[PDB]
Design an enzyme around this catalytic site. Structure first.
Site, PDB file in Angstrom:
ATOM      1  N   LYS A  53       0.827  -1.204   0.000  1.00  0.00           N
ATOM      2  CA  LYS A  53       0.000   0.000   0.000  1.00  0.00           C
ATOM      3  C   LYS A  53       0.870   1.267   0.000  1.00  0.00           C
ATOM      4  CE  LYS A  53      -3.787  -2.608   1.943  1.00  0.00           C
ATOM      5  NZ  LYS A  53      -4.656  -2.959   3.097  1.00  0.00           N
ATOM      6  N   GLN A  97      -4.504  -1.668   9.552  1.00  0.00           N
ATOM      7  CA  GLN A  97      -4.385  -2.988   8.950  1.00  0.00           C
ATOM      8  C   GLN A  97      -4.906  -4.068   9.897  1.00  0.00           C
ATOM      9  OE1 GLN A  97      -3.553  -3.401   5.807  1.00  0.00           O
ATOM     10  NE2 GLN A  97      -3.554  -5.650   5.761  1.00  0.00           N
ATOM     11  N   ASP A 120     -10.426   3.323   3.848  1.00  0.00           N
ATOM     12  CA  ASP A 120     -10.477   1.865   3.785  1.00  0.00           C
ATOM     13  C   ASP A 120     -11.905   1.343   4.038  1.00  0.00           C
ATOM     14  OD1 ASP A 120      -9.180  -0.697   3.586  1.00  0.00           O
ATOM     15  OD2 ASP A 120      -9.090  -0.796   5.769  1.00  0.00           O
TER      16      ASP A 120
HETATM   17  N1  LIG Z   1      -8.033  -2.696   7.246  1.00  0.00           N
HETATM   18  C1  LIG Z   1      -7.717  -3.607   6.325  1.00  0.00           C
HETATM   19  N2  LIG Z   1      -7.978  -3.347   5.025  1.00  0.00           N
HETATM   20  C2  LIG Z   1      -7.685  -4.236   4.062  1.00  0.00           C
HETATM   21  O1  LIG Z   1      -7.953  -3.976   2.745  1.00  0.00           O
HETATM   22  C3  LIG Z   1      -7.091  -5.431   4.437  1.00  0.00           C
HETATM   23  C4  LIG Z   1      -6.827  -5.689   5.768  1.00  0.00           C
HETATM   24  N3  LIG Z   1      -7.138  -4.767   6.699  1.00  0.00           N
HETATM   25  N4  LIG Z   1      -6.224  -6.911   6.088  1.00  0.00           N
HETATM   26  C5  LIG Z   1      -6.278  -8.085   5.157  1.00  0.00           C
HETATM   27  C6  LIG Z   1      -7.045  -7.786   3.853  1.00  0.00           C
HETATM   28  C7  LIG Z   1      -6.434  -8.592   2.712  1.00  0.00           C
HETATM   29  N5  LIG Z   1      -5.696  -7.590   1.917  1.00  0.00           N
HETATM   30  C8  LIG Z   1      -5.021  -7.883   0.788  1.00  0.00           C
HETATM   31  C9  LIG Z   1      -4.542  -6.880  -0.064  1.00  0.00           C
HETATM   32  C10 LIG Z   1      -3.857  -7.198  -1.231  1.00  0.00           C
HETATM   33  C11 LIG Z   1      -3.670  -8.530  -1.579  1.00  0.00           C
HETATM   34  C12 LIG Z   1      -2.928  -8.881  -2.870  1.00  0.00           C
HETATM   35  O2  LIG Z   1      -2.788  -8.040  -3.754  1.00  0.00           O
HETATM   36  N6  LIG Z   1      -2.500 -10.138  -2.968  1.00  0.00           N
HETATM   37  C13 LIG Z   1      -1.812 -10.654  -4.167  1.00  0.00           C
HETATM   38  C14 LIG Z   1      -1.040 -11.930  -3.815  1.00  0.00           C
HETATM   39  C15 LIG Z   1       0.076 -11.665  -2.785  1.00  0.00           C
HETATM   40  C16 LIG Z   1      -0.381 -11.802  -1.317  1.00  0.00           C
HETATM   41  O3  LIG Z   1      -1.616 -11.832  -1.090  1.00  0.00           O
HETATM   42  O4  LIG Z   1       0.518 -11.835  -0.443  1.00  0.00           O
HETATM   43  C17 LIG Z   1      -2.873 -10.953  -5.260  1.00  0.00           C
HETATM   44  O5  LIG Z   1      -2.534 -10.747  -6.438  1.00  0.00           O
HETATM   45  O6  LIG Z   1      -4.011 -11.350  -4.907  1.00  0.00           O
HETATM   46  C18 LIG Z   1      -4.158  -9.536  -0.753  1.00  0.00           C
HETATM   47  C19 LIG Z   1      -4.834  -9.221   0.422  1.00  0.00           C
HETATM   48  C20 LIG Z   1      -5.878  -6.370   2.431  1.00  0.00           C
HETATM   49  O7  LIG Z   1      -5.388  -5.321   2.008  1.00  0.00           O
HETATM   50  N7  LIG Z   1      -6.730  -6.404   3.528  1.00  0.00           N
END
Ligand SMILES: Nc1nc(O)c2c(n1)NC[C@@H]1CN(c3ccc(C(=O)N[C@@H](CCC(=O)O)C(=O)O)cc3)C(=O)N21
Ligand SMILES: NC(=O)c1ccc[n+]([C@@H]2O[C@H](COP(=O)([O-])OP(=O)(O)OC[C@H]3O[C@@H](n4cnc5c(N)ncnc54)[C@H](OP(=O)(O)O)[C@@H]3O)[C@@H](O)[C@H]2O)c1
Ligand SMILES: NC(=O)c1ccc[n+]([C@@H]2O[C@H](COP(=O)([O-])OP(=O)(O)OC[C@H]3O[C@@H](n4cnc5c(N)ncnc54)[C@H](OP(=O)(O)O)[C@@H]3O)[C@@H](O)[C@H]2O)c1
Ligand SMILES: Nc1nc(O)c2c(n1)NC[C@@H]1CN(c3ccc(C(=O)N[C@@H](CCC(=O)O)C(=O)O)cc3)C(=O)N21
Ligand SMILES: [Cl-]
Lengths: 282, 282
Positions: A53, A97, A120
């Site tokens: 982020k 987070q 968020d």
């Molecule tokens: N407050 C708050 N806001 C959020 O929006 C989140 C949070 N907490 N905690 C967990 C979830 C899950 N999450 C999140 C964000 C990005 C990705 C992502 O881009 N993942 C990659 C694979 C790599 C990986 O997940 O480590 C994908 O291409 O899906 C996965 C989960 C996230 O950002 N989250």
């Protein structure tokens, strides 16, 4: 074969627009948009997502104020930190987070975030407003999903959307967003009976259970739109909450994992922070 | 065979201790709990329901403050009236009877009511808090329905609840309350495509459409719990949103119309007013 709902591509596209908007804002006001990112404790995935982020902020020409608090932080301590950020006019958005250390009342701390900085979309106020059609920043992942669906011309009105999972930041807001878009909405969870049958009735399926490949491919309705909001690391390719191997023969469209919902989670957060900065500095 | 879910009898039972509580509060504080009722315009049914609520307040030793505003009242004017009541320390709860005249932004006016006095449970904040499991006054009718089910020992956890209708003060809060009670929840509305099919799978069916007997008896599952939250007056006995003639052959339990949901709508408002007064005065 199914349409690949390419969230990675869409995120990049959205960020190109955000970049020019941020640069224009900085040129006019002399000030940089700021996301405050709060990371509490040492959770590895949390560290990674805050890192991503922060990167996303800088890609679109803004920055982040990184707040790192120890694992033993109290609810009261975290509330104090959030109020400092609320009162800081230089901070336009606040991210807490999830999941924070379990001794902390996370809900109380979410709700401490001022609505104007709830980029968020974690506040009860923000959720309720979104559910009742009033203006508010949406929960990052669900709003990202709606954007993916919209920009891929996916029919939602009149479709039966089944959301598997009812979490505060994912399942519940997802259901209410689909409802607002005129889907018939079924919300499932760990106490749901006949889950395979309910999933088979779904025209749109959202996997939001945080368990690897729980939603079985043979439960999926032929021609369904398949959204997998999960991620679970593995040797030679991570997997989400849905069995997606051979999904191209089954779905009309689907979000791949990785590179589907994930990128749009991050970019939705950043877009809403740019919006907040544009408002605050306008 | 069906158990009649007797809202009239339950409302009477519940008022017994509400009166004891109010009389204790009054004896202790020398102050009378007040519900402010706001009736805007000439809707006959609205006037009837406001009087019933005023009467209910008086039955349990409280009083009402009767605010009556003209048909052509504007959003600005209504908001100003609500802010007067918010800042009135002699007023402990505020009711804005729906539907207000069309020119008024009802949502904006609901949301102007202070959370502490939102005893009818109409604010976005109250809805989001309820949805996320935080303490809040619930929307009167849905919360009344949950009370009816609880008092009659109706099994909710794991059942497939179908809510037909998604209105701000009824269908939506009803859905979230059932979800909180661990039902699998399907929310239907005017854009639902196979409503009969979905109703036929409902273990608990909530009729919240505001259309006389729209939900057909032929759609009801044998052994279903049937909740009819509608009322439509007719010569010698009104009807609700569900065809209930002969429902006793099909349902395991059902709410009669009249004398089912209605009495408990009023009781819920009054109870939550008692709660607000106790908090404010006690
Ligand atoms: N407050 C708050 N806001 C959020 O929006 C989140 C949070 N907490 N905690 C967990 C979830 C899950 N999450 C999140 C964000 C990005 C990705 C992502 O881009 N993942 C990659 C694979 C790599 C990986 O997940 O480590 C994908 O291409 O899906 C996965 C989960 C996230 O950002 N989250
Ligand atoms: O922690 P986390 O990552 O799991 O996120 P979380 O915040 O616990 O959310 C996970 C969601 O998935 C649901 N779920 C878990 N197992 C399920 C199953 N076998 N079938 C249907 N729904 C299921 C949970 O139901 P509950 O809300 O019933 O726990 C919960 O709503
Ligand atoms: O005013 P008012 O009395 O109409 O109350 P209202 O505030 O319009 O609420 C009525 C609810 O019932 C729904 N509904 C109306 N007709 C329906 C139908 N034929 N099938 C399924 N749902 C239906 C509406 O759908 P919508 O929310 O789609 O209008 C709405 O959610
Ligand atoms: N803000 C707000 N709060 C509410 O809780 C209501 C509102 N607006 N407007 C309409 C609904 C519906 N409603 C209501 C309350 C009581 C009864 C009731 O007890 N009815 C009798 C039959 C007599 C009749 O309905 O005229 C019954 O036994 O059902 C019916 C609707 C009511 O009070 N409602
Ligand atoms: Cl009386």
């Amino acid at each position: 074969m199914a349409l690949v709902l390419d969230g990675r591509a869409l995120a990049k596209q959205i960020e190109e627009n955000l970049l020019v908007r941020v640069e224009a804002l900085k040129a006019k006001t002399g000030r940089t948009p700021i996301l405050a990112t709060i990371l509490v404790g040492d959770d590895g995935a949390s560290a990674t997502y805050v890192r991503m982020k922060g990167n996303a902020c800088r890609r679109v020409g803004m920055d982040s104020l990184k707040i790192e608090l120890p694992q033993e932080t109290t609810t009261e301590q975290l509330l104090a930190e959030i109020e400092k950020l609320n009162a800081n006019p230089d901070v336009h958005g606040i991210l807490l987070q999830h999941p924070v250390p379990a001794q902390i009342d996370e809900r109380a701390c979410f709700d401490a975030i001022s609505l104007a900085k709830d980029v968020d979309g974690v506040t009860c106020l923000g959720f309720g407003r979104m559910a009742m059609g009033e203006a508010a920043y949406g929960s990052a992942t669900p709003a990202g999903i709606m954007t993916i669906l919209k920009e891929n011309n996916i029919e939602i009105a009149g479709k039966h959307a089944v959301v598997v999972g009812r979490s505060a930041i994912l399942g519940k807001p997802m259901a209410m967003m689909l409802l607002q878009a005129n889907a018939t909405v079924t919300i499932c969870h760990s106490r749901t009976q006949n889950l395979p049958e309910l999933v088979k009735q779904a025209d749109i399926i959202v996997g939001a259970v945080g368990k690897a490949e729980l939603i079985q491919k043979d439960w999926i309705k032929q021609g369904a739109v398949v959204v997998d909001a999960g991620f679970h690391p593995r040797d030679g390719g991570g997997v989400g909450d849905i069995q997606l191997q051979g999904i191209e023969e089954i779905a009309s469209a689907y979000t791949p994992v990785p590179g589907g919902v994930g990128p749009m989670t991050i970019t939705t957060l950043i877009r809403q922070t740019v919006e907040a900065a544009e408002k605050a500095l306008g």
